[PDB]
Write a protein that binds this ligand. Structure first.
Ligand SMILES: Oc1ccc(Br)cc1
Ligand SMILES: Oc1ccc(Br)cc1
Ligand SMILES: Oc1ccc(Br)cc1
Ligand SMILES: Oc1ccc(Br)cc1
Ligand SMILES: Oc1ccc(Br)cc1
Ligand SMILES: Oc1ccc(Br)cc1
Ligand SMILES: Oc1ccc(Br)cc1
Ligand SMILES: Oc1ccc(Br)cc1
Ligand SMILES: Oc1ccc(Br)cc1
Ligand SMILES: Oc1ccc(Br)cc1
Ligand SMILES: Oc1ccc(Br)cc1
Ligand SMILES: Oc1ccc(Br)cc1
Ligand SMILES: [Fe+3]
Ligand SMILES: [Fe+3]
Ligand SMILES: [Fe+3]
Ligand SMILES: [Fe+3]
Ligand SMILES: [O-]
Ligand SMILES: [O-]
Lengths: 491, 323, 83, 491, 323, 83
């Protein structure tokens, strides 16, 4: 016979001891551990709600991969990617290039907690988290790998984060700030709670669903399986949050959440918004990016924050409004600057689409529809050279994303500047600037693409030089997804 | 225009078709792209300084750490497949020896021996778990890190086997204090202080090179010979078939760890000066290992002989690596 | 040769715009309009373009030159339709 | 360490012993064993070319099912069967209804050998064969089961062989004769060698390939996996054949092969021929049923028979010709009598199709095209009542299939009658009649649908009565696959 | 027109949603559709007569044999999953005990004991394999047959374990005659004649009911108690850990066989008169089982006691089934 | 009421056909034509239908009745176009 898991589980996490040959601070340095005055005994209250043991882990995961890799191989010589909508294909290349290596990097984020968390249970769950991310990184390199011969763009599933292409810099700016350069407790708050539980867990669910609609059962299965692993480690932040509130650290906890959520939002608006609102065919659009956010992200955050006795972010009112524009700018920005990304941005501004955008968003054509009105005319009046840039867009020093807001009649684009120690910074939002001011020494000497351009680090100092600096060349350089097919509609 | 390749761009130029292992494990770390500012933030953050000092400025040098390849070529998929099998075997031992009441026919003497020399290992194995998980996050290459990733899961596995067995022992001998005294034994029994001082000091060796050395080349071989070999041999002689075979099962993971550790050392010796660096580190930590083995084994029956065998066997691991 | 950011009216994003330290706001706006007008903004000859500092909203004369407006390098500026 | 499989394999099959408390004949009765004078020692020479042991078996098969069942579940809520060509859907219902339970029945065929074969190696391989068929039967019941709510026709995957619908009687006539009522050695010859190695092994391969073209990856994976198990037990006949030839039994062996191959062909022409020549869309037609047979069945049989020192069947010359008509009759017969089967037969006689049939078959329209000419006119001239029967077609007493041959100009339909002991039999071919004459006591008192009708066993004795006797009712009763859509072509 | 159902037509009318097990295992045999002419050929063929006499005319009766349900609900998919795990465990025992040289520390006496009482079992286990595979092809229902199908694979598994172990023994003691003498022992050693006469006669009991009884209710319990329990207990006492645990592993299959056999007997007793039929058969075969146990166990150490335990334990299996 | 099998010329399969023991071959052919003509065979009024035994190919008169042709129950018969 065998024991019931409940009878011996606590012993797997009864591993803390009183150091003697070295001091507690030496063994657990604050910069890595982040115990924040809270004692070892107090941290031991940490108790993950979802429990699992080694034998169970290797057994379940073995099965998940058997299925996933089996699906992939069965549909391998089917070449769906070929006869699939350019909007979808482009969606995948964007996903992989931005996520593969970051998934892997997260394995080190977990490893950070596995070694330096004073909470024994967090240390073990982080070890499983470490293995989860090791999996995601590998499986999301193995899958796109099947398409390297169809286009060099697929090579970016591995190369993107190794370049200085703006989106890559944006991705790294976020991740390094949330999970790679923060102490153990901070990581559980900002990555596992704020980002993995708050966004990616439900996101991946929709991606998998949408991928299913598209007819890509290989990619659908991929994301479905990976998503089932998320909760297992995403759970690590709640307990840390209770411990901090439980003790005298509610404020410190409060802003990590404030900061982490905004930053997750910014990066989220450029990579997910454009996707379900423009790259997705019209007859396959369930709800709008705004609808999706309110019903699957906004609500949960409110519920969650409530249960942990935390307050809604100070910027929450503004954040709620931006759901009506931010991802619209980000999109237009990416499509306009289409040759500077590794995937083909879709316009998604056909007659029907443009109205769809009007139903979901009040007065879209009176603002966003404007800019698109022009661009569409130039393409109708054979002047394609006016739909691409000849200059760099101003960049937010925090999210390293273009500073863009409401256009057209209801114009409102703003720039929340800030001068600190003989230097002028630019932020595409009030929250973005705030993230900077609450801790300057952390972002101070960093520099976005523009700062580098102005310092002479991009040479030659012209378009061709910037392209070569971002490691981009024809073949991978972006252009309109449907090859401008959507123009024949306007003559 | 750029033409599509047959493999990842960084693997193009290879002679033989890249394996799954190579496809999903190579050149993954990006913090090594800019040693001046490893992370995409201010260059003065503590974590920027940590990586520059402990990863980049290590005396153990090489021009292309990403060239390292796991001799076992472990990948997440193959790891689970491999260990799921081993765990099915371990499950058999626990469940079926239980069925034949194996625990009730153990002598009182042996049970007390288990309370002092076996169950407290849960602390030592978790320390090894922390030890290797640090190597994961500070090594200069992703192929090096993954070997650390998997070894870390193995240490958790050893911890887990121990926690389970400890519960079973507490059920069968509720008076001994199984599950309740391990910490006190680990912290106060002279037999464990040798090992305790060794891993506690080793756990604060932040240089990736010294960490690898102190943990995988000095401490682990010492822990494996003392616990898995000596106590495991003793378990066999005392008729504790379960522990005897459990030890043999865990030795298979220990062997895998020695294999990749051996390959890393071999690659390091390609560069002049690294052997001296490694030996200097080994000369630094070997003394604490000796004390660990001495304090632990001296307390076991046939102690002096066990001490000699363990010192000899652990040293041999390093000799076959060229030191 | 002096850098400034252009926040063109009715546009959707601020842009980096190179101007000379001698251009009159009219010339600045002209340069900025190049990176905005006929790209994603309908022209308006009927009206005239003006350039004001974004931080405080200070409207600058049509004949005022970059060298006098002071301006901090990278300074953001608004270009609007007026009379 | 572990031993190499080659060092201990022979011991797994070193199980024969000299009975003492019962006699060899009692323990191994000839009617079940079929040692045919050949001694125990002589049979021990039996040595299967493909070897496998228990641990290897359960490990490999566990993986095959993980994948197959994983594929199915991933594509489950995709409902391909819905938006799939009626020709395909109809193909599956035909496959399942005719094969599911026969696959299972084969597990007993294998069990026959596992117990009564004097060859030790055959006994063990038959035990694995037993498990293989147990699998095929179950997995091919589990898969169609997902469609019971879409149509009652799917219920036939389980019910068909339990009825007296003519195709069911045809299926059982074959199988019971080849594998269920033959002694051990005879089974290895007629089922494993003649039928499984000779037809189903390559057939399933093409089915899987065609299913892949159709876009049914669930069914494709299903057949692909099952097919990989076939060789493992299909191999059992060769060795028995060598032993018989090796000894004085070349003739006895010769006709089992003669008989078995013809019967396999007959049943094959009605269930596979119509499929790839008519139910398969035109733009998805690789080669013709005739091409397929010559290149994947005909050749192998010649090679095989050669290696075993056996002669080509006496009927081989005729058999080669029939590839130019038999499956054409069988088709027309099934479509005409479409309401008497559980699936929707496809006409596959559109303009393009009819020419396709001409390219693959010389002078098709001058013979088969005739009958179809008429039928098409009646449908054009609103007279659908003349495309269905009002009588029973004469049935071959051996293959229990309709007696039909070349029509039109080159008319040649023949009936190879035979009178034996105050009774008149009918056969749709010379070979069919031969199978009867070489062993009368085996088929003598059996009776086909017509014999039963004429004896008063079908009551009421009319169309409605025959339908109810075959367990058919509206909903499952067949009709034109594409609902006569192919007629609009001829006005 | 006919409306589509939620399940197979023959399962419609059920209360709870049919399980996978029920979906792929029920009402599959079609030879029972026409008892006058089971097969679609002449009604006078030998195989028509065989099934009418040995399946249909059996004194063990019931009106709806298809109602039988495997208590373990085994299906092909679940069988492999279950056994693959058990085989991983057995693989561990063989491979890892080999690694620790377990075979070399066995006494000469024990080795000779293995040559006479252990390795020849390959013949007895294959006979059980033939025995149950006959039950497969003659039972009146598919759910009954499948239980026989899986038990048959288990007997092949026991045969296989034995063949492998025999090879290992021949390697370590090439003078004993391992692998070469088993047949002679099985045919001529008085210790085996008891079992041999039992299975040889049982193997020609064609009535499906008597086959089930002679093999699953009388012979198997006798074989399991003598070999797996008695000799296995002896293996343990002689320090042959491998065989001791191998025996325990195989007992798990034996237990499963008793479980379905028990359920079939329970269903049979629903009809008046079947208990008498079963007991009469048991009264017919019990005598040969006693002789088997007596001849085998008497030759082992503590023989008389082993005989009493085996007779007692095997009889208890039938008593708990109501006989 | 007597059973026979119909192998109609230019058809593609023999069929079971009920005829009376008094019908003249002309009537038999008429009954058989019902299960063949206008179904999968083009009629031919210009020509006349005849019925001969299939086993030996014996052509039967037009006015010969089923009762005289002997015939074994189930006997196969050919119906052909002639003059
Ligand atoms: O075609 C598609 C593009 C994007 C998504 Br998300 C789904 C379908
Ligand atoms: O596919 C995606 C994954 C992550 C983010 Br953030 C955005 C899109
Ligand atoms: O519904 C969704 C589709 C795609 C992404 Br990315 C996120 C949500
Ligand atoms: O001169 C330039 C044009 C375009 C970009 Br983007 C950057 C510099
Ligand atoms: O790691 C383990 C494997 C099996 C059991 Br049972 C317990 C723990
Ligand atoms: O190969 C071996 C590995 C570890 C130990 Br401890 C002993 C032998
Ligand atoms: O649509 C199809 C019908 C039959 C076959 Br075979 C393949 C495709
Ligand atoms: O799908 C099929 C399987 C077997 C035969 Br025979 C014919 C068709
Ligand atoms: O190519 C083939 C398609 C279907 C069947 Br059935 C057999 C062969
Ligand atoms: O009278 C009948 C009509 C059709 C068939 Br089929 C059978 C009898
Ligand atoms: O059945 C067996 C399982 C494992 C080995 Br190793 C040998 C035989
Ligand atoms: O449960 C048991 C099954 C078989 C034997 Br032998 C002993 C115990
Ligand atoms: Fe992840
Ligand atoms: Fe995650
Ligand atoms: Fe099969
Ligand atoms: Fe088969
Ligand atoms: O994750
Ligand atoms: O098969």
């Amino acid at each position: 016979s065998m024991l019931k898991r409940e009878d011996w589980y606590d012993l797997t996490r009864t591993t803390n001891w009183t150091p003697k040959y070295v001091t507690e601070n030496e063994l657990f340095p604050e910069e890595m551990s982040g115990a924040r005055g809270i004692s070892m005994e107090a941290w031991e209250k940490y108790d993950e709600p979802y429990k699992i043991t080694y034998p169970e882990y290797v057994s379940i995961q073995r099965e998940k991969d058997s299925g996933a890799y089996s699906i992939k191989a069965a549909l391998e010589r089917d070449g769906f990617v070929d006869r699939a909508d350019p909007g979808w294909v482009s969606t995948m290349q964007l996903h992989f290039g931005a996520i593969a290596l970051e998934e892997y990097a997260a394995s080190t984020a977990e490893a950070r907690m596995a070694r330096f968390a004073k909470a024994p249970g967090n240390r073990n769950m982080a070890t499983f988290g470490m293995m989860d991310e090791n999996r995601h990184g590998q499986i999301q390199l193995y899958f796109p790998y099947a398409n390297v011969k169809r286009s060099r763009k697929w090579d970016w599933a591995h190369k993107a984060i190794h370049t200085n292409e703006w989106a890559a810099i944006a991705a790294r700016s976020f991740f390094d700030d949330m999970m790679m350069t923060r102490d153990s407790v901070a990581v559980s708050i900002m990555l596992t709670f704020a980002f993995e539980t708050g966004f990616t867990n439900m996101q991946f669910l929709g991606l998998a669903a949408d991928a299913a609609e598209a007819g890509d059962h290989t990619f659908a299965s991929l994301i479905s399986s990976i998503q089932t692993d998320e909760s297992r480690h995403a759970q690590q932040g709640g307990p840390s949050l209770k411990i901090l509130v439980e003790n005298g650290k509610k404020d410190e906890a409060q802003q990590m959440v404030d900061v982490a959520i905004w930053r997750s939002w910014k990066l989220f608006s450029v990579l997910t918004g454009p996707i379900m609102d423009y790259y997705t065919p019209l007859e396959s659009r369930n709800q709008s990016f705004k609808e999706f956010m309110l019903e699957w992200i906004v609500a949960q955050f409110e519920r969650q924050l409530l249960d942990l006795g935390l307050d809604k972010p100070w910027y929450w009112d503004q954040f709620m409004q931006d759901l009506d524009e931010t991802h619209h700018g980000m999109h237009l920005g990416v499509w306009y600057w289409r040759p500077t990304v590794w995937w083909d941005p879709a316009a998604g501004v056909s007659p029907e689409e443009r109205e769809w955008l009007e139903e979901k968003y009040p007065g879209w054509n009176d603002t966003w529809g404007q800019c698109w009105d022009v661009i569409t005319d130039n393409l109708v009046n054979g002047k394609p050279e006016l739909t691409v840039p000849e200059t760099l867009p101003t960049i937010c020093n925090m999210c390293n994303l273009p500073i863009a807001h409401t256009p057209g009649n209801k114009w409102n684009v703003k720039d929340y500047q800030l001068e600190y120690e003989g230097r002028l910074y630019h932020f595409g939002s009030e929250a973005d600037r705030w993230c900077f001011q609450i801790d300057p020494e952390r972002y101070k000497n960093h520099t976005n693409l523009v700062d580098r351009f102005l310092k002479g680090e991009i040479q030659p100092a012209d378009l061709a030089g910037a392209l070569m600096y971002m490691s981009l060349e024809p073949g991978v350089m972006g252009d309109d997804a449907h090859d401008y097919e959507w123009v024949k509609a306007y003559q | 225009a750029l033409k599509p390749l047959k493999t990842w761009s960084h693997l193009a130029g290879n002679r033989r078709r890249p394996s799954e292992y190579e496809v999903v494990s190579t050149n993954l770390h990006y913090f090594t792209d800019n040693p001046e500012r490893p992370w995409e933030l201010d260059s003065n953050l503590p974590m920027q300084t940590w990586y520059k000092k402990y990863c980049f400025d290590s005396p153990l040098k090489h021009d292309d750490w990403n060239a390292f390849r796991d001799p076992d070529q472990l990948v997440y998929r193959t790891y689970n497949l491999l260990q799921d099998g081993q765990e099915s075997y371990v499950q058999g031992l626990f469940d079926q020896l239980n069925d034949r009441g194996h625990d009730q026919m153990l002598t009182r003497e042996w049970v007390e021996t288990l309370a002092r020399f076996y169950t407290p290992a849960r602390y030592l194995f978790h320390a090894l778990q922390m030890g290797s998980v640090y190597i994961h996050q500070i090594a200069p290459a992703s192929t090096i890190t993954n070997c650390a990733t998997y070894e870390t899961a193995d240490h958790l596995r050893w911890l887990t086997h121990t926690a389970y067995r400890t519960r079973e022992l507490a059920n069968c001998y509720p008076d001994v204090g199984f599950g309740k005294r391990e910490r006190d034994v680990w912290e106060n029994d002279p037999a464990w202080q040798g090992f305790r001082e060794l891993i506690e000091k080793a756990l604060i060796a932040w240089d990736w090179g010294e960490a690898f050395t102190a943990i995988n080349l000095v401490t682990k071989p010492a822990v494996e010979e003392a616990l898995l070999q000596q106590l495991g041999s003793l378990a066999q002689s005392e008729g504790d078939t379960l522990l005897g075979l459990l030890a043999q099962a865990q030795k298979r993971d220990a062997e895998r760890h020695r294999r990749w550790s051996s390959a890393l050392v071999k690659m390091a010796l390609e560069k002049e000066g690294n052997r001296e660096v490694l030996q200097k580190w080994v000369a630094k930590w070997e003394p604490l290992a000796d004390k660990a083995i001495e304090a632990y084994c001296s307390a076991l029956p046939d102690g002096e002989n066990a001490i000699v065998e363990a010192k000899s066997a652990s040293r041999y691991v390093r000799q076959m690596m060229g030191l | 040769t002096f850098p400034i950011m252009s926040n063109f009216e009715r546009d959707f994003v601020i842009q980096l715009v190179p101007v000379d330290t001698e251009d009159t706001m009219d010339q600045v706006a002209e340069k900025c309009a190049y990176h905005s007008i006929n790209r994603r903004v309908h022209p308006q000859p009927e009206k005239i373009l003006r350039v004001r500092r974004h931080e405080d909203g200070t409207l600058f004369p049509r004949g005022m030159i970059v060298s006098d407006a002071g301006l901090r390098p990278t300074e953001t500026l608004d270009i609007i339709f007026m009379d």
